[PDB]
Amino acid sequence: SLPMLQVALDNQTMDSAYETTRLIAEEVDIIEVGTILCVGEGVRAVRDLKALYPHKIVLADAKIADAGKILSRMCFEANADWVTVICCADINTAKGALDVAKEFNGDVQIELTGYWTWEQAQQWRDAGIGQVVYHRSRDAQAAGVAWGEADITAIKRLSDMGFKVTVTGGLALEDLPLFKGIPIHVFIAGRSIRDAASPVEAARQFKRSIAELWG
């Protein structure tokens, strides 16, 4: 099943985000309230986006580090479908977010933007976490860290463990072939869509490439 496309709204205000969504809401599968937007506007961003686009999956990229129940409930009460929990969070923080998520028929992803270990990954699975976001840090990318062999190995291993894997971190259209033959769940594009000359055509290019590579 083709990788889906997620747009990251890493905008500081709602109006900046809407300049993107008004173009591409019907060209992507998942609308993400990026961490930058969650911090810029708060959880109203999730509520307002879901109200605009109630037929789409809305993801609140809160990167919950602690207070799993309280922070997940705030996002779900704002009508989020999915929320993120950062990989270094205490295991009880993940479980607590998942418990709330289940009350709302939502889901939790673990955000792999840190150091983390294979034992922790097993803990996530036993806890009933079914999604991870394999994430090349924005700041690592800026310090010259490219997608490499080790990333492919790890993604495959996470998939083999039974996670649906999302891939993200400065993805460009030309990076998609690196991942061919792996059952990627979702590719996230932020800058490569929002900042394109034509965000609509950028999203359509990602979709065509995906349909070729995984078709």
Ligand X SMILES: O=C(CO)[C@H](O)[C@H](O)COP(=O)(O)O
User: Under DSSP, is residue 100 helix (H, G, I), strand (E, B) or coil?
Assistant: helix
For residue 57, report the phi and psi dihedrals to the nearest 5 degrees.
-70, 125
212 classed as catalytic = no
Output 3 or 68, the one with its CB closest to its own copies: 68
Non-local (6+) Cβ contacts of 167 within 8 A are 133, 134, 155, 179, 184, 186, 187, 188
Residues that bind its own copies (CB under 8 A): 10, 12, 35-36, 38-44, 62-63, 65-71, 74-75, 86-90, 92-93, 95-96, 111, 113-117, 120, 135, 137-140, 142-143
Touching ligand X, residues 152-181 (CB under 6 A): 168-171
- Comparing C-alpha atoms, which of 78, 133, 90 is closest to residue 109? 133
102 classed as catalytic = no
Q: CA 93, CA 45: separation in Å to the nearest integer?
A: 23
Choose from ligand X, its own copies, Mg ion, none: what does 120 bind? Cβ within 5-8 Å by kind: its own copies
Known binding-site residues equal: 10, 32, 61, 191
Choose from ligand X, its own copies, Mg ion, none: what does 214 bind? Cβ within 5-8 Å by kind: none
Q: CA 198, CA 34: separation in Å to the nearest integer?
A: 21
Which of 138, 156, 164, 207 does the annotation list as catalytic?
138
Residue of 41, 50, 56, 61 interacting with Mg ion (CB under 5 A):
61
Q: CA 195, CA 186: separation in Å to the nearest integer?
A: 20
Does 106 sit near ligand X (CB under 6 A)?
Answer: no
- Comparing C-alpha atoms, which of 123, 180, 129 is closest to residue 155? 180
Residues that bind ligand X (CB under 6 A): 8, 10, 34-35, 61, 66-67, 135, 138, 168-171, 188-192
Active-site amino acid positions:
35-36, 63, 66-67, 71, 111, 135, 138
